[PDB]
Amino acid sequence: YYYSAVERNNLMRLSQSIPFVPVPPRGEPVTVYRLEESSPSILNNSMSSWSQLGLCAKIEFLSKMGGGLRRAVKVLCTWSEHDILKSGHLYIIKSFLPEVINTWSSIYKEDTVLHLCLREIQQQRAAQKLTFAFNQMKPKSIPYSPRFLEVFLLYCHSAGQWFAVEECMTGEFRKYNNNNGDEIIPTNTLEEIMLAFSHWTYEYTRGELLVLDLQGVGENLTDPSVIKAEEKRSCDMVFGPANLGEDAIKNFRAKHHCNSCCRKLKLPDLKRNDYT
Amino acid sequence: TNYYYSAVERNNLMRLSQSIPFVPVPPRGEPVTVYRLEESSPSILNNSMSSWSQLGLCAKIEFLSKEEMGGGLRRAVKVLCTWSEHDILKSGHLYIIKSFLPEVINTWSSIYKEDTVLHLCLREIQQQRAAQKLTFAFNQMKPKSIPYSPRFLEVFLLYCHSAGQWFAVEECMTGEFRKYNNNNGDEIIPTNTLEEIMLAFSHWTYEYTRGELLVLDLQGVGENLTDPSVIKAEEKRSCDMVFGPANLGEDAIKNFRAKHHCNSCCRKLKLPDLKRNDYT
Ligand SMILES: Nc1ncnc2c1ncn2[C@@H]1O[C@H](COP(=O)(O)OP(=O)(O)O)[C@@H](O)[C@H]1O
Ligand SMILES: Nc1ncnc2c1ncn2[C@@H]1O[C@H](COP(=O)(O)OP(=O)(O)O)[C@@H](O)[C@H]1O
Ligand SMILES: [Mg+2]
Ligand SMILES: [Zn+2]
Ligand SMILES: [Zn+2]
């Protein structure tokens, strides 16, 4: 029937040279592994185990960031297999500094960086399990709910190295307390709740564990330090790579200042006698 | 004075402070860059303009076979798609990668002095798209009474860094791969409706393009076709008769008009006999 000129033109065009400019892909493809949970809806009673099947994710570099032991860059995830990472979402990728790798070079014969990453991610998951328990038991009078971002393990061939990746938060990033026990002076309810949380972890684990270095945006936290409060040696004191002083626990008990949240949580004074 | 954690809760936390087993399943697959021939109006393909993609996409293919099928100017090898950025290709799906015979290149080197292979691929994919556009008009305008719709597979351009070369890629069809008509202008005698429709399609293209184009070498599995030969019925230029590289027989259009036999479909489409006169 009707065989237009547009239709004809578009057909005939295919018979001739159409311009083609091969442009290498944008960004880099990377492999992602997840630390899975046997019971997500009940994270504190769930078992953590590493996934085996690495899924691909496509990331594009945007910018950057530096803290203590890591270098961080902000990226965009344009796509990923089975949505292991959310497409159209911003992420932060972290890698350990030279000194840090050089410090655990002895502790970890081969795949030092890989192990450092595994431990770092496992550390944040531990904190996560504690915030989860916290939100389950805290009184209804306590509004907010601390939460740690999930971190994923990442392998990049481009760079030929292992990294940790997590969602990028938007807003003013702030540190509520640190590895030496210093705390900000709570100017609002949320900050109080955060400060009370570190106290709560100690009491909740019968003085066995303490989470310091609470930092993030709002109630969303990341990069915590999970301290085995009874270890008498730094080398075996922290879950993942962290800058700790052996005075940490003692310092926290001395410096911490209980607030209306600590009281709402019915938490005992950290200065009390441990055998009383 | 409190409500501390349980054993299960404590075990799950403390276990994270220790080395947990991580056995990364070994990496299989070949990294490749996929390029697509895009369309301005994919919804109205026959009224759409074709343009090559600029920015390449990432994908991974498993070369599970060394079996190179075919006897023509090209050879086909099955590969597996582990993953493809944006799922342009389907993961955990079999594809066919096609390349030409060095001889063929050597032949066209005297026409495509530079990046001969890539150029041939660009042409092959453009040729199949031309076939697709005609099939789109065909299925869109054909009478409702006709139950079948010819379909050409989509072909993508693929670059392999490891193999250091360009290939054309398309889904791998499973089933009896057959030919309805060929480059000589010869056709089979239809046994069923599907075949009658395939054969009528070739006739239809000649008619639809007012005698400018003829699609021959209809072949594939069932309705799904691939590797057709879009012939510029009037051209005389050495290698300018077919949109893509193909060996045409001694005056294929002549043979086709002479040997083709119209069927119930040709009549359903109201097509006129090819043996008639061009001018009278
Ligand atoms: N998840 C995040 N979202 C937004 N910004 C972040 C995030 N994590 C870290 N940052 C920013 O990048 C800086 C470095 O953080 P990081 O790489 O974790 O270093 P560190 O080795 O100190 O833990 C921080 O000071 C912070 O401003
Ligand atoms: N899309 C496909 N699906 C399944 N098999 C295919 C496909 N394309 C090609 N083949 C197989 O591989 C062979 C190569 O065909 P083709 O690319 O057309 O090369 P040739 O130039 O020799 O005709 C075919 O004969 C067929 O058996
Ligand atoms: Mg063939
Ligand atoms: Zn307190
Ligand atoms: Zn006919």
From Swiss-Prot, chain A:
Gene name for this UniProt entry: Trpm7
UniProt binding sites for ADP: G67, G68, L69, R70, K94, E166, E167, M169, D223
Boundaries of every Alpha-type protein kinase domain copy: 42-270
PTM-bearing positions, type Phosphoserine: S15, S17, S46, S63, S106, S225
Subunit field text: Homodimer. Homotetramer. Forms heteromers with TRPM6; heteromeric channels are functionally different from the homomeric channels. Interacts with PLCB1.
General function of this protein: Bifunctional protein that combines an ion channel with an intrinsic kinase domain, enabling it to modulate cellular functions either by conducting ions through the pore or by phosphorylating downstream proteins via its kinase domain. The channel is highly permeable to divalent cations, specifically calcium (Ca2+), magnesium (Mg2+) and zinc (Zn2+) and mediates their influx.
Gene source species: Mus musculus
Lineage: Eukaryota, Metazoa, Chordata, Craniata, Vertebrata
Modified residues (Phosphothreonine): T31, T131, T276
Changes seen on gene knockout: Inactivation of Trpm7 in mice results in early embryonic death (6.5-7.5 days). Mice die as a result of trophoblast defects and consequent failure of implantation. Tissue-specific null mutants shown defects in cardiac and renal morphogenesis, organismal Zn(2+), Mg(2+), and Ca(2+) homeostasis and thrombopoiesis.
Effect of C261A: Loss of kinase activity
Name by which UniProt lists this protein: Transient receptor potential cation channel subfamily M member 7
Binding residues annotated for Zn(2+), in chain numbering: H199, H256, C258, C262
Included stretch of the parent chain: 1551 to 1828 of 1863
Family from the record: In the C-terminal section; belongs to the protein kinase superfamily. Alpha-type protein kinase family. ALPK subfamily.
Tissue-wise expression: Found to be expressed in brain and skeletal muscle, with stronger signals in kidney, heart, liver and spleen.
Compartments in which it is found: Cell membrane; Cytoplasmic vesicle membrane
Catalytic residue list: D213
Result, substituting G245D: Severe reduction of kinase activity
Post-translational modification summary for this protein: Autophosphorylated; autophosphorylation regulates TRPM7 kinase activity towards its substrates.
